[PDB]
Write a protein that binds this ligand. Structure first.
Ligand code: NP7
Length: 302
């Protein structure tokens, strides 16, 4: 079987490159961040604009939801993260401490912690309630491209231009594993069950790792990725897919097990830097850079 993703909605509004799209855990909303300094919220099913969230002084690289879908965290060129109340649009906390651009961010499942990665080569862990930086991890020797908590929050995975993926004990702050040619690692995330890590490198390659055995189980190629830190995803609502943007302006979909490309989605007119998979429906959101500036919503039967 192969999926049949068809374009349903194009969401215009951002005035610069869109950096990140994320579906809310409860499936109602899509949040988008942009170099235009703005966060925008959209209805996930009808693509209808909901609100604009403003406050950051410079462009925003990433946005992430709390488990209850009530809060957002953003990561900005202004060296801060901000925590937002989604319903009011209000900035609740500004997370200060990174010495350079913040590129990536995530809540833990418990949503009492935030993790962030910066151009400053560190990974920071923040208390959501107080805004205080609890730990600064000397994670990498180059900009940190991605940070993600595993399913139980006990682990953090980080990736960097230094060519390394690292797994950290959240509680102890110590490095549990280093996956080490080492081309820049531009993306990393845990699988839904926490057993695997999907990692992208800037040599046109995505890899699925069993990090406990430290072994590469699958490779996904055929797409273009040598410049931009492009977000990838596990698609699990229907067929079991791998989804990624690409520098040829397409969204690529692979069969996770066989590694064959099952679909390529055309429509965008610039690099697709971010994709998101809806938590319950077979819906993909994709976002493109400055020649495009739109988010597209795609729907499949499997
Ligand atoms: C969702 N992902 C999170 C991680 N991310 C990222 C990773 C690595 C580096 N870097 O080491 O250069 C830079 C960026 N950010 C930007 O490229 C960017 C920054 C501000 C505004 C717009 C954009 Cl697109 C891209 C989006």
């Amino acid at each position: 079987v192969k999926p049949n993703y068809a374009l349903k909605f194009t969401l215009a509004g951002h005035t610069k490159a869109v950096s990140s799209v994320k579906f809310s855990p409860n499936g109602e909303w899509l949040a988008s961040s942009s170099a235009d300094k703005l966060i925008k919220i959209w209805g996930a099913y009808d693509g209808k604009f909901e609100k604009t969230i403003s406050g950051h002084k410079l462009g925003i690289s990433d946005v992430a939801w709390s488990s209850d879908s009530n809060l957002l965290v953003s990561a900005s060129d202004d060296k801060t993260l901000k925590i937002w109340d989604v319903s009011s649009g209000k900035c609740l906390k500004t997370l200060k401490g990174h010495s350079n651009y913040v590129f990536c961010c995530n809540f833990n499942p418990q949503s009492n912690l935030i993790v962030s990665g910066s151009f400053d080569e560190s990974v920071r862990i923040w208390d959501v309630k107080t805004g205080k930086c609890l730990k600064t991890l000397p994670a990498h020797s180059d900009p940190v491209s991605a940070v993600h908590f595993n399913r139980d929050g006990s682990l953090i995975v980080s990736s960097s231009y230094d060519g390394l993926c690292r797994i950290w004990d959240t509680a102890s702050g110590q490095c549990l594993k280093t996956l080490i040619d080492n081309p820049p690692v531009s993306f990393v995330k845990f699988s839904p069950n926490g057993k695997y890590i999907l990692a992208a490198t800037l040599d046109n390659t995505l890899k699925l790792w069993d990090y406990s055995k430290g072994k590469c189980l699958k490779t996904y190629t055929g797409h273009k990725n040598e410049k931009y830190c492009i977000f990838a995803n596990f698609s699990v609502t229907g067929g079991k897919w791998i989804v990624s943007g690409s520098e040829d302006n397409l969204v690529y979909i692979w069969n996770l097990q066989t590694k064959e490309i099952v679909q390529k989605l055309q429509g965008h007119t610039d690099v697709v830097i971010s994709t998101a998979c809806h938590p319950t429906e077979n819906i993909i959101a994709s976002a493109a850079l400055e020649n495009d500036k739109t988010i597209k919503l795609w729907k499949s039967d499997c």
